[PDB]
Amino acid sequence: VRVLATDLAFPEGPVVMPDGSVVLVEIRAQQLTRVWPDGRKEVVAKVPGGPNGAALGPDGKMYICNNGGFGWFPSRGTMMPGAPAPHEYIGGSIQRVDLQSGEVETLFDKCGEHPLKGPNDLVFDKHGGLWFTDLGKRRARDMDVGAAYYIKPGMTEITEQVFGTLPLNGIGLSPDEATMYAAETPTGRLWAFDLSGPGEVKPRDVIYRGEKGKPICGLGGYQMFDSLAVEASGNVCVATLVSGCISVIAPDGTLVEQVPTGDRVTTNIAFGGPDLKTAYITLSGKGELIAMDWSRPGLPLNFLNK
Numbered sequence: 001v002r003v004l005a006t007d008l009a010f011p012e013g014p015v016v017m018p019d020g021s022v023v024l025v026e027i028r029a030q031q032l033t034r035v036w037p038d039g040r041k042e043v044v045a046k047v048p049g050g051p052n053g054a055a056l057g058p059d060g061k062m063y064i065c066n067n068g069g070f071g072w073f074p075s076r077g078t079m080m081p082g083a084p085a086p087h088e089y090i091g092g093s094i095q096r097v098d099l100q101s102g103e104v105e106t107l108f109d110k111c112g113e114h115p116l117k118g119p120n121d122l123v124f125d126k127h128g129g130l131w132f133t134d135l136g137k138r139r140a141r142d143m144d145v146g147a148a149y150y151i152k153p154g155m156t157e158i159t160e161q162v163f164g165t166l167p168l169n170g171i172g173l174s175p176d177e178a179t180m181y182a183a184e185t186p187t188g189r190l191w192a193f194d195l196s197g198p199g200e201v202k203p204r205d206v207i208y209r210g211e212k213g214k215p216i217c218g219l220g221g222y223q224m225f226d227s228l229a230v231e232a233s234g235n236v237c238v239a240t241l242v243s244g245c246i247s248v249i250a251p252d253g254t255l256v257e258q259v260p261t262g263d264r265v266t267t268n269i270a271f272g273g274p275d276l277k278t279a280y281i282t283l284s285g286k287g288e289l290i291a292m293d294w295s296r297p298g299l300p301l302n303f304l305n306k
């Protein structure tokens, strides 16, 4: 276990480059940041609002889930995200950053007639379609439902694929891309959505209240999920809040293991390095990017690793 960088303002959305550098977002600093393996840092772009998740796109640009902004309040020695005051929330969107110029473009701020609320994380399929989660926003006495969306290849249009769940956070594709996984934050449940084809959830039979997917795993106790990354084996590695670990879930739902990280606010994971057997993990409470040896290889991401 190795600490690569410190003094990051709530790191998230790690994208591990082939050379082992990491481009990540700092939600509280509202920026996209390049982190080199020795700890030296460079700001790539200012991204006002709440840049929350990142993924390299087929056009070579860095696509960003912008949750619109958080309130920030001190808790357990860390500045934690909270419900934003109206003046702290500028609207959720999907954005794109030219890494060489720092230019930021806003691509979508609605799906149909409904504004996007709190876009969180995202993953590309091999065709260039873009899956992403919406965590929703919190307000003083209520909160938005979760959702998942798909933007068709070429960034032509956005469609609603999952709606009405609790806040959704991590999202990933199986190796064969026939299954999309969404992590539900407050319940610590990983939901598996069968796809009839690229970008299209195949609705499953309801279990209790309008479920479109299968809850293949739900952790016990007081454990919540954040973002995730998939292994070439098909296992889903989910950053686990409160207990502070990576939860490795097999495609069948089995809890393979839990890898402690030392931070109750462990938020994301991404694979890179030789054989993609290195796990790069954002400890957002401590403000750190860490590296860890992984026993199995990561799933190469489209347009970054393959």
Ligand SMILES: O=c1ccc2ccccc2[nH]1
Residues within 6 Å of the ligand: 012, 052, 081, 120, 135, 169, 226, 227, 241, 265, 267
């Ligand atoms: O992606 C996110 C977004 C919000 C958030 C808040 C508290 C802890 C982890 C979080 N991860």
Ligand SMILES: [Ca+2]
Residues within 6 Å of the ligand: 012, 052, 053, 120, 121, 169, 170, 226, 227, 267, 268
């Ligand atoms: Ca997240």
Ligand code: NA
Residues within 6 Å of the ligand: 014, 227, 228, 229, 268, 269, 270
């Ligand atoms: Na990730």
